[PDB]
Design a protein around this ligand. Structure first.
Ligand code: CLA
Ligand code: CLA
Ligand code: CLA
Ligand code: CLA
Ligand code: CLA
Ligand code: CLA
Ligand code: CLA
Ligand code: CLA
Ligand SMILES: CC(/C=C/C=C(C)/C=C/[C@@]12O[C@]1(C)C[C@@H](O)CC2(C)C)=C\C=C\C=C(C)\C=C\C=C(C)\C=C\[C@@]12O[C@]1(C)C[C@@H](O)CC2(C)C
Ligand SMILES: CC(/C=C/C=C(C)/C=C/[C@@]12O[C@]1(C)C[C@@H](O)CC2(C)C)=C\C=C\C=C(C)\C=C\C=C(C)\C=C\[C@@]12O[C@]1(C)C[C@@H](O)CC2(C)C
Lengths: 213, 216, 165, 210, 230, 41
């Protein structure tokens, strides 16, 4: 009647087929309460968007570092950036904290009171910060092409695609971290090592992943 | 509504029409300190005195600092002006502080007794005719008369604007003095020297680069 | 030189004690290798000892005939001779925190008094209310003196006393 | 909103700028003069800064114009930012003294007509000497119009006044900017731009300065 | 009915065929919103016209001045009017005309009056098609001409992208690279320069240097998305 | 998990969490600021 992560197992009661990417996966019943579930929806979406950006950036810089262009790998790019350019890391870090604190506090107090942030308090901007749904702000600023507007079915499809590519990118970033922890080289370094000899070059032949042998 | 946090629950004691009449009520009370109306009245007075004192002091810090940085004056930095000002003085700092404490406690006790009982310093015969002018106005903290020579409170059309300007410039100057203290403790140079050093290289000369503010 | 005490910067037993502790630690150190975990640990402990003694001697402490730092609890003797940060300033540093704890507890009790089952909000903490009060109780001296000046800090004699009062 | 000329044809004009003020082009992107009394002050403030800026930029250009033509003054050729260092029959101390005293008279007169129009239209000494009634604050009239203007054509004349005035305000701001930037006299800067207009733009000078 | 980009496809519901060039291609649904579709329509129009003039300019340049390279033709002009005065005049005049077009976009009937001379103004027209002094001598119907304009413009947009990538991977001009393709069809295509296989990636080198001097500075001139190249 | 979070709101669990947090804060203070006998800074 609907795709479920563990087939046969019926979905829990709080996971109806209303949210994007709903497959009934809550074996710990973490989002049982609706307000907590809204908080976790926004958390999944922010994590997945940040992870989509992160995975795309890692993939692109690894593409540029593999073909021989002057690119550091994702585990070395911060040092290279703050050392090549004369960048002070505490200054940059607190600049980022100021900007992200403004943005995320706006988003926070639109979670706590959804109608807010649109009173013209910020700079007169009312309808750019009104917010469409929980985790989907929309507006002229976060949606200049208006893809949430117009067609609704296309918007639900894009929601599914967004959350699904986001979970995939989160898994991909966790995989980047684990592969740097294991093989010590870049992600596409690992990919080329796999494509060279798929057998005999994989996680079973690290020495760290399977410690038995 | 002019909230300090646009989405926050403004406390109920700052939403009452008594507190919304106060100058610059942007609903900032995340500690619930002026919940009692008598306490809020006393704290309005405290904010006003603190903000006027801070505006005077921060003027006397940056204006002559800006004029000795512009070569117009030779006033030293504020954290050293007392030492060199008491050397050219007729008095030591102890006797000067004694006279200052007497002359300040007198008027501050007058203000105290006017806060405790509004308009009470104007009961006749207390001063030698000047008590006629010490009754203050309907609004506490805005005494007027001898303290308002240019009659700028008699218009009743810019009055809320005057109050808002006063309290906002005053909160700004309170923060400015707190920053002067912090920057004397942190950089050791003058506030205008700090401004020049930041404007020369902002991305490398700031509180993120000294080894005192962020010690990690 | 408040109570005949010598400053720790010029005390001889203080230096003798530093040398004694460092001699003990290097006696333990000589049995280990150059760069081993025991050797690095003992070197770190020696450095912590040296820094501790240097920082106590720098802070203007007064040492006795035993070389140990002696604190000055008297305000007036501490504020005059530069020993306020020994007992006197940490006094208010404590009292702020302690009255803060007590005021948050009082506010929580007064808050849960009005509910239907007030005792169940004491075995089961209302963490939202508790955190809200724990954050907004940082102004406990001002709010406490304002509750005191209004007379709403102390209960009247509706207190449960005994037959002979 | 009306069919008056605007600073941005098609912009949402604010509304409180209805055209009653000379120079109404709806330019209030900060919405500064939203209050009526604020605008009643700002009108006269603009007019005074404007007239003082017109006098100012006249005193900037014309001295250097008669210098670059080659006339005869003892204070000829000297810049406007080096005219404070010039010496005269008196030091600048007594000059500021007399200047501030006379201006404390006349500006307080102007202010007393501003807070109540019709007040200061008469002399202390000569009661018979008077300014006529019906004049606005900022436009005193009477002996201030001794050559017979302002009978008609008053709206366009006020428009011309405020237009040349805003232009001279911008001119003096540019004089400050170029005297701190180029280090030369402003008419020498004009001549420098007229020599090589394409490589003596502000971007080129700023980039060669850094 | 109308000719679609896919002959058997049903077009999106917002694409009813009313626009000039509505061949039913909105697979992402970017013009689903009615308000953003107008901005995207004007964007297509100006991208079209800019790319058409740009392609004609590169073509004419490689015809009548083949010694210069259009990718390099910024540093090989050396006008006496300065590199900054050029930027100044173009910045100011383009800011003027583009803000006028933007005010046509925001408020449609607003900016038609000639500001300086009061007696001229444009007629009330559509958004994106001013007419009047812009458009004398219309050779035929208007809708067919708009269709032709947008089609030649889309072809010119793709043509400028091809120009850029063929100037990057070959270092030659459009007509020069076309003569290279005609001199060896099977050996000069992008398929014959590049190949990625599961085990090997062959990206062609770009003949555009990483940076050009241009009078005492270092202008960074990177190939477009090298690395992502095949 | 409303009941589970109610359980974590009980007196002993909240005390464990709060005293773990307090003890860890004091411990990290005493790590990064070793041997604080007086208020010198
Ligand atoms: C009144 C506002 C004000 C202003 C304009 C400045 C300006 C400056 N400060 Mg000071 N400062 C202030 C308040 C202020 N400070 C206060 C209240 C504190 C105590 C928390 C400090 C503590 C402080 C230290 C310890 C240091 C500076 C330094 C500096 C300079 C670099 C900025 C920096 O490192 O981050 C400033 C640090 C902060 C913690 C920011 C506090 C500002 C608060 C949040 C209010 C202002 C916000 C306001 C909305 C925007 C500015 C208003 C302005 C337009 C009027 C710069 C000249 C550094 C310096 O001297 O470099 C040469 C430096 O080492 N400041
Ligand atoms: C009751 C008597 C008593 C007293 C007065 C002390 C006093 C002290 N002991 Mg001793 N001790 C005692 C009993 C006592 N102890 C007992 C019974 C034992 C056996 C368990 C010990 C075992 C012991 C050891 C083993 C050690 C001490 C140490 C210390 C020092 C700790 C200083 C410190 O932590 O700085 C803390 C400084 C602060 C400023 C923190 C104050 C608290 C808060 C955080 C301040 C608020 C700031 C801010 C607003 C918080 C932010 C809010 C947050 C939620 C974000 C101090 C001299 C240490 C030392 O070196 O002694 C010299 C040490 O190593 N003690
Ligand atoms: C949030 C996700 C994320 C994060 C944290 C980073 C972080 C970084 N990227 Mg990556 N990147 C990302 C997404 C991300 N990227 C995506 C989605 C793409 C596509 C890229 C493409 C990309 C390239 C092509 C390059 C970087 C570079 C960088 C570094 C410096 C960026 C810089 O100079 O600021 C830029 C600041 C501004 C533009 C001002 C605003 C830094 C390690 C650069 C580098 O040196 O690291 C290898 C670099 O060359 N990134
Ligand atoms: C608990 C009672 C107590 C006792 C017995 C003393 C004892 C003394 N005080 Mg202290 N003093 C105390 C409490 C006490 N003090 C308190 C609570 C204060 C207020 C904070 C002071 C403030 C104080 C000052 C300001 C001075 C003394 C001085 C003195 C000496 C006289 C003597 C050693 C004097 C001193 O320096 O002694 C040499 C001195 O000048 N005392
Ligand atoms: C519109 C008002 C105005 C303006 C913009 C200036 C501007 C200037 N004056 Mg002038 N000045 C003015 C009114 C004004 N003054 C008045 C009313 C008096 C009194 C009559 C003076 C008397 C005066 C003297 C005596 C000197 C200046 C100087 C200066 C320069 C100071 C530069 C600096 O900060 O160092 C600057 C160009 C100084 C200067 O040019 O030295 C380089 C200088 O020596 N001014
Ligand atoms: C996208 C438009 C565009 C752009 C940015 C360029 C840019 C360039 N062209 Mg190319 N060109 C274009 C279109 C364009 N061209 C078209 C459409 C043609 C065919 C007519 C040409 C024919 C052409 C030749 C034959 C040559 C260039 C050259 C050059 C370079 C120097 C230009 C110069 O010296 O002009 C100087 C400035 C002028 C001549 C004044 C412009 C003429 C008047 C004022 C008309 C402008 C207004 C007019 C109404 C057009 C507005 C509509 C617009 C949207 C098209 C420069 C790299 C030269 C080169 O390679 O450098 C050595 C060169 O030899 N171009
Ligand atoms: C629109 C447009 C586009 C797509 C380009 C594209 C390019 N320009 Mg040109 N350019 C433009 C406008 C444009 N420019 C304008 C308006 C100016 C005048 C300021 C220039 C001045 C200019 C110079 C002076 C140079 C370029 C260069 C370049 C190349 C950088 C890689 C690339 C082919 C550089 C180049 O030739 O790279 C090889 C170069 O040196 N451009
Ligand atoms: C100036 C400047 C310079 C010299 C470079 C240099 C580079 N960039 Mg570019 N880049 C810059 C600014 C700059 N970046 C800014 C401001 C943005 C935004 C980007 C966005 C960007 C992307 C999206 C990509 C590059 C890439 C690259 C690298 C390969 C060249 C290329 O684009 O193909 C090269 C290291 C590419 C990399 O290779 C994988 C690439 O895909 N850059
Ligand atoms: C894996 C992950 C989360 C996994 C969560 C899972 C499985 C949750 C499972 C469950 O809860 C549910 C669903 C339901 C419960 O009932 C059951 C369980 C089982 C409990 C998140 C990753 C989240 C990952 C994120 C957010 C990654 C962001 C990455 C970024 C920003 C990368 C940035 C950079 O790499 C670049 C781009 C370039 C570098 O040079 C600089 C840096 C900064 C290093
Ligand atoms: C009076 C004042 C400064 C006065 C300065 C003077 C006289 C300076 C004088 C001198 O320099 C000169 C002129 C010349 C020098 O040579 C000599 C001296 C003498 C040195 C500063 C006040 C400075 C006052 C300050 C900084 C007060 C800050 C208060 C804050 C932030 C309160 C925050 C909150 O209380 C609210 C608002 C609501 C709560 O619910 C939440 C919280 C967050 C608790």
């Amino acid at each position: 009647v609907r795709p479920v992560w563990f087939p046969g197992n019926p979905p829990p009661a709080h996971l109806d087929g209303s949210l994007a990417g709903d497959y009934g996966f809550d074996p710990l019943f973490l989002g049982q309460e609706p307000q907590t579930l809204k908080w976790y929806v926004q958390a999944e979406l922010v994590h997945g968007r940040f992870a989509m950006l992160g995975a795309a950036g890692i993939i692109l810089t690894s593409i540029g570092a593999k073909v021989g262009l002057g690119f550091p790998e994702w585990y070395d790019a911060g040092k290279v950036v703050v050392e090549k350019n004369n960048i002070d890391f505490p200054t940059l870090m607190v600049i980022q904290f100021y900007l992200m604190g403004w943005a995320e506090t706006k988003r926070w107090y639109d979670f706590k009171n959804p109608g807010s942030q649109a009173d013209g308090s910020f700079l007169g901007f009312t309808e750019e910060f009104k917010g469409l749904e929980n985790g989907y702000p929309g507006g002229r600023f976060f949606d200049p092409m208006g893809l949430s507007r117009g067609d609704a079915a296309k918007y639900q499809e894009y929601k599914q695609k967004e959350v699904k590519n986001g979970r995939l990118a989160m898994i991909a970033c966790l995989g980047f971290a684990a592969q740097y922890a294991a093989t010590g080289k870049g992600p596409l370094d690992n990919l080329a090592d796999h494509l060279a000899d798929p057998n005999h070059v994989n996680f079973a032949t690290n020495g760290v992943s399977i410690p038995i042998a | 509504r002019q909230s300090w946090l646009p989405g926050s629950q403004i406390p109920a004691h700052l939403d009452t029409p008594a507190a919304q009449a106060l100058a610059g009520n942007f609903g900032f009370d995340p500690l619930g300190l002026g919940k009692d109306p008598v306490a809020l009245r006393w704290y309005q007075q405290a904010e006003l005195i603190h903000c006027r004192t801070a505006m005077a002091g921060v003027a006397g810090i940056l204006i002559p600092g800006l004029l000795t940085k512009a070569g117009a004056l030779n006033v030293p930095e504020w954290y050293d002006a007392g030492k060199v000002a008491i050397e050219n003085s007729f008095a030591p700092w102890g006797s000067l502080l004694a006279v200052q404490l007497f002359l300040c406690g007198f008027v501050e006790a007058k203000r105290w007794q006017d806060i405790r009982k509004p308009g009470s310093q104007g009961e006749p015969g207390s001063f030698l005719g000047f008590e006629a002018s010490l009754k203050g106005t309907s609004e506490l903290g805005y005494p007027g008369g001898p303290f308002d020579p240019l009659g700028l409170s008699k218009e009743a059309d810019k009055w809320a604007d005057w109050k808002l300007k006063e309290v906002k410039n005053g909160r700004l100057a309170m923060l400015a003095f707190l920053g002067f203290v912090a920057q004397k403790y942190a950089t050791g140079a003058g506030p205008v020297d700090n401004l020049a050093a930041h404007l020369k290289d902002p991305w490398h000369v700031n509180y993120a680069t000294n080894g005192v503010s962020l010690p990690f | 030189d408040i109570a005949g005490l010598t400053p720790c910067s010029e005390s001889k037993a203080y230096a003798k004690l530093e040398k004694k502790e460092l001699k003990t630690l290097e006696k333990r150190l000589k049995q280990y290798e150059a760069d081993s975990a025991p050797a690095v640990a003992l070197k770190a402990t020696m450095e912590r000892t040296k820094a501790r003694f240097a920082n106590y001697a720098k802070a203007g402490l007064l040492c006795g005939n035993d070389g140990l730092p002696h604190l000055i609890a008297d305000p007036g003797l501490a504020l005059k001779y530069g020993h306020a940060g020994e007992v006197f300033i940490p006094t208010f540093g404590f009292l702020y925190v302690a009255g803060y704890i007590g005021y948050v507890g009082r506010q929580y009790l007064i808050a849960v008094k009005g509910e239907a089952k007030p005792t169940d909000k004491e075995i089961i903490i209302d963490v939202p209310l508790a955190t809200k009060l724990a954050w907004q109780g940082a102004g406990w001296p001002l709010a406490a003196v304002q509750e005191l000046q209004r007379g709403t800090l102390l209960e009247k004699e509706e207190n449960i006393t005994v037959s002979p009062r | 909103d009306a069919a008056l000329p605007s600073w941005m044809p098609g912009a949402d004009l604010p509304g409180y700028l209805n055209g009653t003020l000379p120079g109404d082009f709806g330019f209030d992107p900060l919405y500064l003069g939203q209050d009526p009394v604020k605008l009643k002050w700002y009108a006269q403030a603009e007019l005074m800064n404007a007239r003082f800026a017109m006098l100012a930029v006249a005193g900037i250009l014309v001295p250097e114009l008669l210098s670059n033509i080659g006339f005869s003054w003892p204070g000829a050729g000297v810049a406007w930012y080096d005219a404070g260092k010039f010496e005269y029959f008196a030091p600048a101390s007594s000059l500021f003294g007399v200047q501030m005293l006379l201006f404390a008279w006349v500006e307080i007169r102007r202010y007393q007509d501003f807070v109540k129009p019709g007040s200061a239209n008469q002399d202390p000494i000569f009661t018979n000497n008077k300014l006529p009634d019906g004049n606005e604050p900022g436009y005193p009239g009477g002996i201030f119009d001794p050559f017979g203007w302002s009978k008609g054509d008053i709206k366009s004349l006020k428009l011309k006044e405020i237009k040349n005035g805003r232009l001279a305000m911008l001119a003096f701001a540019g004089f400050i900017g170029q005297a701190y930037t180029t280090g030369t006299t402003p008419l020498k800067n004009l001549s420098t731009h007229l020599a090589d207009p394409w490589s003596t733009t502000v971007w080129q000078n700023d980039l060669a300065r850094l | 009915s109308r000719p679609l980009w896919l002959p058997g496809s049903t077009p999106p519901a917002h694409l009813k065929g009313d626009l000039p060039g509505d061949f039913g291609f909105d697979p992402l649904g970017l013009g689903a919103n009615a308000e953003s579709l107008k901005w995207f329509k004007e964007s297509e129009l100006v991208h079209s016209r800019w790319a058409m003039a740009a392609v004609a300019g590169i073509l004419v340049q490689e015809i009548v001045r083949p010694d210069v390279f259009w990718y390099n033709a910024g540093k090989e002009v050396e006008s006496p009017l300065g590199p900054l005065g050029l930027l100044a005049v173009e910045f100011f005049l383009m800011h003027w005309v583009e803000v006028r077009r933007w005010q046509d976009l925001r408020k449609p009937g607003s900016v038609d009056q000639d500001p300086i001379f009061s007696q001229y103004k444009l007629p009330p027209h559509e958004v994106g098609y001013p007419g009047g002094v812009f458009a004398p001598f219309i050779p035929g119907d208007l809708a067919e001409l708009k269709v032709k304009e947008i089609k030649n413009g889309r072809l010119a947009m793709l043509a400028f992208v091809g120009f850029v990538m063929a100037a990057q991977v070959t270092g030659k001009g459009p007509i020069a690279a076309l003569q290279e393709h005609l001199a060896d069809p099977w050996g000069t295509t992008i398929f014959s320069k590049a190949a990625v296989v599961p085990g090997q990636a062959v990206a062609p080198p770009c003949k555009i240097p990483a940076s050009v001097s241009y009078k005492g500075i270092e202008i960074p001139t990177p190939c477009f998305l090298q690395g992502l190249w095949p | 998990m409303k009941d589970f979070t109610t359980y974590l709101s009980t007196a002993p669990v909240i005390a464990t969490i709060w005293f773990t947090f307090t003890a860890g804060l004091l411990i990290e203070i005493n790590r990064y600021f070793p041997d604080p006998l007086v208020f010198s800074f």
